[PDB]
Amino acid sequence: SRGTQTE
Amino acid sequence: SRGTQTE
Amino acid sequence: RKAVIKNADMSEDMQQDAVDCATQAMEKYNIEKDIAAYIKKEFDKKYNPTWHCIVGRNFGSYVTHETKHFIYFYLGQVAILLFKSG
Amino acid sequence: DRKAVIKNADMSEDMQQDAVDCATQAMEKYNIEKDIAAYIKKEFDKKYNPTWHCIVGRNFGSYVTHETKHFIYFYLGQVAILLFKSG
């Protein structure tokens, strides 16, 4: 499990 | 299988 | 904010729980990743793994979901995609 | 503007390159993020077996669970692409 976030 | 698109 | 369900292959009760869970997430967090994480983690716990969640104002998706486990909805102008696969 | 920048990966280097090349072709062909995503997902299902999922966009966060060695998150120009296998 892991996440991302746009700039 | 299917798609979505923000308006 | 105002919940508008766009697509759903999901029971009525689970749809409402998705909305409720997202609403709680948006109360707690500002960062999209963190809203997504809350919703995913709650759904894994309540309805078994493996869920995936996308929260954002601008995106398109193409995913494959398990039957009866897909929802796409807005809270205000923020779109939430939540589905099971795995 | 389609310069590639890898943000996070759990993927072989050659598969990362293939993902970039696939997304580049997708963006040459398709204007709409959903359709870009669909091209990439479908090509990865075909080449690397199902089940892949793809998000393409300028503003989103995610939290997902992937299979070991099958996750990438990258930009092409100003568009972010998340591509991963689960199922």
Residue numbers in the entry:
A (entry chain E), B (entry chain G): 1 to 7
C (entry chain C): 4 to 89
D (entry chain A): 3 to 89
Report text from the authors:
The LC8 dynein light chain (DYNLL in mammals) is a highly conserved 10 kDa protein that was originally described as a potential cargo binding adapter of both dynein and myosin 5a motor proteins and as an inhibitor of the neuronal NO-synthase enzyme. Subsequent studies demonstrated that it binds to and regulates dozens of other proteins unrelated to the cytoskeletal motors. It is now considered to be a eukaryotic hub protein. Apo- and ligand-bound structures, determined both by X-ray diffraction and NMR spectroscopic studies, revealed that DYNLL forms a homodimer possessing two identical ligand binding sites. In the complexes two 7-residue peptides bind to parallel grooves at the edges of the dimer interface expanding the two central β-sheets.
For crystallographic studies we used DYNLL2 because its binding site and binding properties are identical to those of DYNLL1, but it lacks a free surface exposed cysteine and hence is chemically more stable during crystallization. Crystal structure of the Ac-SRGTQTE-DYNLL2 complex was solved and refined at 1.31 Å resolution. The asymmetric unit contains four chains forming two dimers. In the resulting electron density map the bound Ac-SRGTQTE-peptide could be clearly identified. One side of each sheet is flanked by two helices while the other side forms the dimer interface. Both Ac-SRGTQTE peptides bind identically to their symmetry related binding sites forming a sixth β strand in the grooves created at the dimer interface. Interestingly, in the in vitro evolution derived Ac-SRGTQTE-DYNLL2 complex Ser-4 participates in an analogous H-bond with the same threonine.
